[PDB]
Amino acid sequence: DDYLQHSIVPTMHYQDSLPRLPIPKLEDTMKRYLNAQKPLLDDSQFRRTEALCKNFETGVGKELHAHLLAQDKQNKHTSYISGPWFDMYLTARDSIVLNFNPFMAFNPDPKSEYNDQLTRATNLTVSAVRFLKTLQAGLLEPEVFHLNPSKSDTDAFKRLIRFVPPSLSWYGAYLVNAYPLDMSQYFRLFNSTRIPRPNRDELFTDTKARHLLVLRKGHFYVFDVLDQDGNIVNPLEIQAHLKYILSDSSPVPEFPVAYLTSENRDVWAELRQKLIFDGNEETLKKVDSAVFCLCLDDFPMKDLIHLSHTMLHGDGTNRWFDKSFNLIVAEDGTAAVHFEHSWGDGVAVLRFFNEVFRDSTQTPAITPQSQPAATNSSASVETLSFNLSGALKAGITAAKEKFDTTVKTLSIDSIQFQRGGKEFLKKKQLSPDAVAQLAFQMAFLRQYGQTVATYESCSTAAFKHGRTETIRPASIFTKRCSEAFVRDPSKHSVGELQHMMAECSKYHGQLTKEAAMGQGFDRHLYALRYLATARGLNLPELYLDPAYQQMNHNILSTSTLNSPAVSLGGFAPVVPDGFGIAYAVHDDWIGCNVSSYSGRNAREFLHCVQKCLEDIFDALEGKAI
Numbered sequence: 303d304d305y306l307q308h309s310i311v312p313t314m315h316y317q318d319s320l321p322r323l324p325i326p327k328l329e330d331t332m333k334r335y336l337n338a339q340k341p342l343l344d345d346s347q348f349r350r351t352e353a354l355c356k357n358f359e360t361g362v363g364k365e366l367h368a369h370l371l372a373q374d375k376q377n378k379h380t381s382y383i384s385g386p387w388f389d390m391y392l393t394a395r396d397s398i399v400l401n402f403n404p405f406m407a408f409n410p411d412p413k414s415e416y417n418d419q420l421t422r423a424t425n426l427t428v429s430a431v432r433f434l435k436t437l438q439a440g441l442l443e444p445e446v447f448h449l450n451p452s453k454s455d456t457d458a459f460k461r462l463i464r465f466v467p468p469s470l471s472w473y474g475a476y477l478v479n480a481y482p483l484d485m486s487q488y489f490r491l492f493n494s495t496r497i498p499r500p501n502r503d504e505l506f507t508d509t510k511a512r513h514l515l516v517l518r519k520g521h522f523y524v525f526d527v528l529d530q531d532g533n534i535v536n537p538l539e540i541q542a543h544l545k546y547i548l549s550d551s552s553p554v555p556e557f558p559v560a561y562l563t564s565e566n567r568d569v570w571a572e573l574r575q576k577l578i579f580d581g582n583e584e585t586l587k588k589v590d591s592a593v594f595c596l597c598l599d600d601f602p603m604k605d606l607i608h609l610s611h612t613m614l615h616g617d618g619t620n621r622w623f624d625k626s627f628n629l630i631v632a633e634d635g636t637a638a639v640h641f642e643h644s645w646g647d648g649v650a651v652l653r654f655f656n657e658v659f660r661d662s663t664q665t666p667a668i669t670p671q672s673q674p675a676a677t678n679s680s681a682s683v684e685t686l687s688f689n690l691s692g693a694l695k696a697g698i699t700a701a702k703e704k705f706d707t708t709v710k711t712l713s714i715d716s717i718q719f720q721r722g723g724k725e726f727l728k729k730k731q732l733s734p735d736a737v738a739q740l741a742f743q744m745a746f747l748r749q750y751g752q753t754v755a756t757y758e759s760c761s762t763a764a765f766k767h768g769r770t771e772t773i774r775p776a777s778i779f780t781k782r783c784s785e786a787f788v789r790d791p792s793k794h795s796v797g798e799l800q801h802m803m804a805e806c807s808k809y810h811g812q813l814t815k816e817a818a819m820g821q822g823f824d825r826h827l828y829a830l831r832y833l834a835t836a837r838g839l840n841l842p843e844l845y846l847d848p849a850y851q852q853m854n855h856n857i858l859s860t861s862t863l864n865s866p867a868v869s870l871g872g873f874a875p876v877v878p879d880g881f882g883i884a885y886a887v888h889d890d891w892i893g894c895n896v897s898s899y900s901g902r903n904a905r906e907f908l909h910c911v912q913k914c915l916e917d918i919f920d921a922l923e924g925k926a927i
């Protein structure tokens with residue numbers, strides 16, 4: 303059948319009974335905010351912030367909190383942060399390229415020849431539509447985080463829970479320490495796009511569409527991957543259409559339209575309207591409503607730097623940046639999912655990503671020896687054409703100048719630390735994630751002699767319409783431990799550094815659990831600011847404090863997702879003087895892919911990260927520094 307999975311439990315079985323996302327006590331948000339400020343502020347900056355905090359907590363903040371709670375109680379079908387968070391993305395006017403869109407790259411097919419570009423593009427594409435079909439059929443297994451997989455993640459639990467009504471099913475999984483996740487974001491994974499509009503962008507979906515959008519040398523192509531009966535088009539026919547696309551010898555267009563999706567959001571909103579005015583609505587509707595966008599690049603990868611540049615931004619001609627995701631397949635079979643961040647988070651993309659990798663490689667639709675179906679692809683496949691006015695052409699030239707000039711200033715480099723990873727760190731009773739994060743704090747002290755605002759993403763998908771919460775890994779413990787390692791290695795014994803590292807780790811683990819439970823401060827303070835603004839009130843003095851603005855000017859912006867499917871990921875910094883740190887602790891090694899603009903140096907930082915991990919592992923091994 304066309305299904306990559308056959309769950310006896312309906313995909314959506316838990317969604318009705320997911321726990322509502324908790325609003326913290328204002329007193330706890332304030333304390334947690336000040337705790338994260340302690341490592342960042344001089345003493346008089348801190349007392350200034352502490353005083354604004356007390357004024358907020360007793361006054362306008364107390365009142366905002368009261369309304370947020372009452373508003374939440376009116377809207378128990380959703381989460382307090384859902385609207386504000388969507389609005390955060392969609393009102394933002396900056397280019398989504400680099401500011402927002404990340405990538406995750408697949409490991410190769412472990413069968414060498416299956417990495418042929420036509421073979422791999424057909425196989426990945428077909429596994430992606432199989433995902434779509436399985437989700438549509440409610441045959442995708444529900445997302446569940448298990449505390450005791452061996453006992454709750456079992457045929458036997460599944461045969462029982464399927465009988466509990468969705469109004470109560472969450473409770474059953476909870477009672478066996480299993481934690482179902484929100485899956486509402488999968489409504490926008492496919493047939494979906496972000497549409498630029500003034501003020502606030504729009505999220506568009508068209509479930510009725512059956513066609514694929516392919517980009518090659520910046521030419522646009524569509525063909526059906528689902529027939530009129532709802533079945534997947536024969537893979538050997540999909541393979542012929544892809545072969546046919548791969549045979550076009552048209553050079554890159556003089557005005558590649560995809561550039562426009564990299565623009566400032568107001569500029570692009572305006573130019574899109576001109577496109578409609580000049581009669582391109584039908585063409586745009588076909589781009590917008592496609593299952594996803596397949597990008598076919600005609601070069602192989604030179605190295606991981608080249609790979610990261612390619613999957614993160616490319617040359618601007620060959621990604622439709624607005625689309626829910628772009629599935630990229632290069633000339634050497636190197637593939638990745640580049641995605642737009644407003645509609646959903648890493649956790650939902652990861653599931654899709656893991657299922658497609660598994661299916662495409664273990665149950666491939668075609669083989670590298672498959673013969674394409676005899677079929678007339680000039681009938682099946684339409685090459686789209688945009689009617690470009692003089693203003694549209696000038697618009698595209700300007701998009702291209704901005705793209706090229708901004709991209710030139712981006713550097714990305716990586717390290718593979720091979721002394722150890724999870725296995726050694728767990729043996730030492732330390733959280734591996736805390737160790738990675740301490741290394742980044744420590745490397746930055748070494749490189750710049752400062753402690754800076756640090757961001758780590760954490761899913762709150764365990765709750766109804768939960769998104770992410772911010773983990774703030776820069777603490778008084780990472781700061782004191784960094785100072786000990788960098789500023790006076792002499793002063794401390796291996797025992798003391800070991801104990802210091804253990805305190806970082808205990809604090810990190812605490813913030814982690816709190817963030818996953820919705821008990822960080824960032825989302826809560828953001829929702830109060832949002833509410834004040836939406837009510838038409840002046841922005842409260844708390845948010846005008848430079849220490850607040852500084853907390854949200856994230857110089858160290860970090861993220862990790864891990865799975866056997868992912869080789870590496872990448873994203874740009876959020877601020878011009880920042881780093882964008884994609885990392886993973888594996889069983890045996892630690893990988894970081896770091897980005898920076900001109901105002902920082904990724905290469906030196908990785909040298910400092912490398913050095914810091916070696917000192918960390920020595921101290922843990924019993925040696926001096």
Ligand SMILES: COc1ccc(Cl)cc1S(=O)(=O)N1CCc2c(C)cc(C(=O)Nc3ccc(C(=O)O)c(Cl)c3)cc21
Pocket residue numbers: 646647648649650652735759760761762769770814861862863864865886
């Ligand atoms: C053994 O580790 C894992 C096991 C299974 C999985 Cl699915 C993921 C991981 S992990 O590598 O991704 N993991 C390590 C510790 C950790 C922490 C502290 C946070 C997160 C996390 O929530 N990541 C994350 C990062 C970014 C986003 C996003 O939307 O951008 C989202 Cl939803 C989530 C993952 C992980």
Ligand SMILES: CCCCCCCCO[C@@H]1O[C@H](CO)[C@@H](O)[C@H](O)[C@H]1O
Pocket residue numbers: 400401402403404405406643648757758759859860861862863864870871872873874875876882884885886
């Ligand atoms: C190792 C895998 C790394 C890729 C992670 C996929 C999700 C990345 O999401 C990224 O998170 C950052 C906040 O931490 C933001 O600054 C970026 O704009 C965003 O793309």
